[PDB]
Amino acid sequence: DECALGANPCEHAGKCLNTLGSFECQCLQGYTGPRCEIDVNECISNPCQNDATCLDQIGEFQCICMPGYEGVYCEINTDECASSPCLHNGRCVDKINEFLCQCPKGFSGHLCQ
Amino acid sequence: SSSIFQLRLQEFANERGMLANGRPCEPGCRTFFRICLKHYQATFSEGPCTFGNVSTPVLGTNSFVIRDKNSGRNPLQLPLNFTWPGTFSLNIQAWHTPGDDLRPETSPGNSLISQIIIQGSLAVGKNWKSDEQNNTLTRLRYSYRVVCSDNYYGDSCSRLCKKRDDHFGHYECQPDGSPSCLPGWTGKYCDQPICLSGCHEQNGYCSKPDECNCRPGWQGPLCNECIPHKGCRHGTCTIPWQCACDEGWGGLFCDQA
Ligand SMILES: *[C@@H]1O[C@H](CO)[C@@H](O)[C@H](O)[C@H]1NC(C)=O
Ligand SMILES: *[C@@H]1O[C@H](CO)[C@@H](O)[C@H](O)[C@H]1O
Ligand SMILES: *[C@@H]1O[C@H](CO)[C@@H](O)[C@H](O)[C@H]1O
Ligand SMILES: *[C@@H]1O[C@H](CO)[C@@H](O)[C@H](O)[C@H]1O
Ligand SMILES: *[C@@H]1O[C@@H](C)[C@@H](O)[C@@H](O)[C@@H]1O
Ligand SMILES: [Ca+2]
Ligand SMILES: [Ca+2]
Numbered sequence: 516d517e518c519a520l521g522a523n524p525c526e527h528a529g530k531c532l533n534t535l536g537s538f539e540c541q542c543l544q545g546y547t548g549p550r551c552e553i554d555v556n557e558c559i560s561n562p563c564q565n566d567a568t569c570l571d572q573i574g575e576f577q578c579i580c581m582p583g584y585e586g587v588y589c590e591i592n593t594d595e596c597a598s599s600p601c602l603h604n605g606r607c608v609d610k611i612n613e614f615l616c617q618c619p620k621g622f623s624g625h626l627c628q
Numbered sequence: 629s630s631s632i633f634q635l636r637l638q639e640f641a642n643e644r645g646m647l648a649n650g651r652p653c654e655p656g657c658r659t660f661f662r663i664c665l666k667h668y669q670a671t672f673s674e675g676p677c678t679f680g681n682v683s684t685p686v687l688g689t690n691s692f693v694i695r696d697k698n699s700g701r702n703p704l705q706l707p708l709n710f711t712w713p714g715t716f717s718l719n720i721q722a723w724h725t726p727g728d729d730l731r732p733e734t735s736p737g738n739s740l741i742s743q744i745i746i747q748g749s750l751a752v753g754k755n756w757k758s759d760e761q762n763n764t765l766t767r768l769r770y771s772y773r774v775v776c777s778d779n780y781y782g783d784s785c786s787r788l789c790k791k792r793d794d795h796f797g798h799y800e801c802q803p804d805g806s807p808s809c810l811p812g813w814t815g816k817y818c819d820q821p822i823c824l825s826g827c828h829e830q831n832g833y834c835s836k837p838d839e840c841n842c843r844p845g846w847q848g849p850l851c852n853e854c855i856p857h858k859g860c861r862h863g864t865c866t867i868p869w870q871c872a873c874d875e876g877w878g879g880l881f882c883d884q885a
């Protein structure tokens with residue numbers, strides 16, 4: 516029927532499906548509309564937090580986090596003290612893309628070393 | 629690759645040929661450019677080029693005017709894996725190389741000349757936005773724009789429009805991506821033929837433009853004329869398969885006074 520009639524009405528590599536006396540387009544992920552000619556905006560749901568920036572890609576969304584934040588939705592404030600940085604029983608103070616080591620007396624330097 | 633960032637280098641002024649470190653070029657500043665396009669960040673520049681990076685070959689020495697190249701590739705081309713966000717950050721660096729012009733970035737003696745930085749908002753369009761950057765040592769004059777990939781339309785290049793003239797459609801492309809129906813066609817995708825002028829909307833149809841075919845029980849150029857009941861001799865019709873007797877006639881098929 517409709518699909519064998521030459522070219523492809525579904526534009527972005529979508530599959531042609533024959534209805535009766537007509538057809539419908541099986542759109543690949545990230546495409547909508549009758550004949551898949553429109554790029555779906557994957558960033559409508561505003562998935563990412565912490566003042567990030569959403570990038571609408573083909574079939575998926577990508578977010579650039581503000582410095583110090585991470586995760587797919589930029590939902591995680593990175594514990595910069597996770598690696599146990601301050602040595603010799605120093606104290607660790609996490610902030611944002613930044614960490615400070617409280618230095619006990621007799622020790623100095625960035626890592627209190 | 630739905631949208632494209634275009635960057636045209638126009639003119640670069642660098643008399644004396646001075647590097648960043650204050651040393652003069654020897655023998656002259658064989659200048660190539662590194663471009664870094666990334667997202668708008670009000671805070672200090674951190675991270676890589678998220679929108680894409682590109683290095684150019686040596687374009688000139690010291691002060692020179694840059695010509696367009698249809699096939700270097702000026703204006704520069706940056707295809708994006710994403711829809712244009714509207715905001716951006718642009719980093720243009722001028723460099724010097726003692727090595728070959730083929731891939732100047734692949735040379736050990738590379739030294740920086742000068743660089744500039746701009747960020748802000750930009751809307752998709754064929755309109756070139758031009759800007760100058762003057763300093764005591766160097767001057768840079770350039771222009772840039774964001775356009776849609778070929779056959780792509782809309783404010784965000786998110787709609788595809790390839791022109792058709794076959795069974796699936798007969799249309800041209802409007803700037804917003806919506807089909808512009810060819811003469812004699814209608815519908816969303818312009819695949820519905822416009823029947824002959826005056827052809828009965830209810831009783832007539834067509835498969836080709838300016839044609840008029842009659843649904844069962846009708847005839848004529850406009851399919852507006854009924855066909856009386858088979859065997860109707862002295863009677864008329866308004867609706868197919870009828871036999872409304874004339875004057876002085878009667879009976880079902882109208883044939884007896
Ligand atoms: C940059 O320098 C040029 C000199 O050729 C001058 O014409 C132009 O106005 C300057 N741009 C400014 C001052 O913004
Ligand atoms: C399939 O149906 C659509 C409307 O849904 C029509 O435009 C096409 O002509 C038909 O093949
Ligand atoms: C909207 O947010 C959801 C999170 O559930 C994500 O899966 C979608 O891709 C996004 O458009
Ligand atoms: C984990 O430890 C490393 C030391 O290698 C430090 O650089 C990081 O800041 C910390 O998170
Ligand atoms: C995307 O990145 C974030 C971090 C902010 O700088 C935004 O303004 C930008 O659009
Ligand atoms: Ca069908
Ligand atoms: Ca998309």
Ligand SMILES: [Ca+2]
Nearest residue numbers: 593609610611
């Ligand atoms: Ca933190």
